[PDB]
Design an enzyme around this catalytic site. Structure first.
Site, short mmCIF file in Angstrom:
data_model
loop_
_atom_site.label_atom_id
_atom_site.label_comp_id
_atom_site.label_asym_id
_atom_site.label_seq_id
_atom_site.Cartn_x
_atom_site.Cartn_y
_atom_site.Cartn_z
N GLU A 283 -34.95 24.17 2.95
CA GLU A 283 -34.30 25.47 2.99
C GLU A 283 -34.14 25.94 4.42
O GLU A 283 -33.06 26.38 4.83
CB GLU A 283 -35.12 26.48 2.15
CG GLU A 283 -34.96 26.26 0.64
CD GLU A 283 -33.58 26.54 0.07
OE1 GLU A 283 -32.66 26.96 0.81
OE2 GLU A 283 -33.38 26.23 -1.11
N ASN B 10 -23.81 32.89 2.37
CA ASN B 10 -23.24 32.21 1.17
C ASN B 10 -21.77 32.55 1.03
O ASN B 10 -21.30 33.61 1.52
CB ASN B 10 -24.03 32.64 -0.05
CG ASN B 10 -25.51 32.31 0.07
OD1 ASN B 10 -25.86 31.22 0.53
ND2 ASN B 10 -26.37 33.22 -0.33
N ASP C 206 -20.13 33.72 -1.39
CA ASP C 206 -19.93 34.97 -2.07
C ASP C 206 -20.21 36.23 -1.23
O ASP C 206 -20.14 37.32 -1.78
CB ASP C 206 -20.68 35.00 -3.40
CG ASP C 206 -22.21 35.13 -3.25
OD1 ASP C 206 -22.76 35.08 -2.12
OD2 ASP C 206 -22.87 35.34 -4.23
N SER D 218 -23.12 37.05 0.05
CA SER D 218 -24.59 37.22 0.14
C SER D 218 -25.12 36.41 1.30
O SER D 218 -24.40 35.58 1.86
CB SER D 218 -25.28 36.87 -1.16
OG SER D 218 -25.23 35.49 -1.48
N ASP E 16 -28.81 34.26 2.67
CA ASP E 16 -30.22 33.78 2.44
C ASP E 16 -31.06 33.94 3.70
O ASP E 16 -30.59 33.67 4.82
CB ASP E 16 -30.21 32.29 2.09
CG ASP E 16 -29.65 31.98 0.70
OD1 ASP E 16 -29.35 32.86 -0.14
OD2 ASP E 16 -29.54 30.77 0.45
N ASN F 210 -32.28 35.24 -1.26
CA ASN F 210 -30.87 35.59 -1.31
C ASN F 210 -30.74 37.09 -1.54
O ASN F 210 -31.37 37.63 -2.45
CB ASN F 210 -30.20 34.82 -2.44
CG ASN F 210 -28.70 34.99 -2.47
OD1 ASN F 210 -28.17 35.75 -1.74
ND2 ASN F 210 -28.00 34.19 -3.28
#
Ligand SMILES: [Cl-]
Ligand SMILES: [Cl-]
Ligand SMILES: [Cl-]
Ligand SMILES: [Cl-]
Ligand code: NA
Ligand SMILES: [Pt+2]
Length: 129
Positions: A35, A46, A48, A50, A52, A59
């Site tokens: 990660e 991301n 969309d 969003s 992380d 997220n």
């Protein structure tokens, strides 16, 4: 902070992640590896809109507030910036909530694709825990 592999295992143990919801410490180390590459400051946008955040790439869509993810929840009741601290407490607390929510560690796409079903014990091999 960029953790070492055994340093992070020790920090995760200390905050009671080891075997939390049945996931061995090596699962959590492996998830962090892929990660964040163990870097508490890691952020990734991301598609969309969003983002992380942190060692475990939590997220903003569901779990923390960053003030720029329309329609999102803040189910860990924290600013996303708390997830970038050198101290992993906030990330651990929030990960505990995530992993309890029904899909276990599959919530972490890198865990599912790169850790799940592998020799995750290799990740804590040689660590003094
Ligand atoms: Cl393990
Ligand atoms: Cl928001
Ligand atoms: Cl810590
Ligand atoms: Cl599970
Ligand atoms: Na949010
Ligand atoms: Pt703790």
């Amino acid at each position: 902070k960029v953790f070492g592999r055994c340093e992070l295992a020790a920090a995760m143990k200390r905050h009671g992640l080891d075997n939390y919801r049945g996931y061995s410490l090596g699962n959590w180390v492996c998830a962090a590896k892929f990660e964040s590459n163990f870097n508490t400051q890691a952020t990734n946008r991301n598609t969309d809109g969003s983002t992380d955040y942190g060692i475990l790439q939590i997220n903003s869509r569901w779990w923390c507030n960053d003030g720029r993810t329309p329609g999102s929840r803040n189910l860990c009741n924290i600013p996303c910036s708390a997830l970038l601290s050198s101290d992993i407490t906030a990330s651990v607390n929030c990960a505990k909530k995530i992993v309890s929510d029904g899909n276990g560690m599959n919530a972490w796409v890198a865990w599912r694709n790169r850790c799940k079903g592998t020799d995750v014990q290799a990740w804590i091999r040689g660590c003094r825990l």
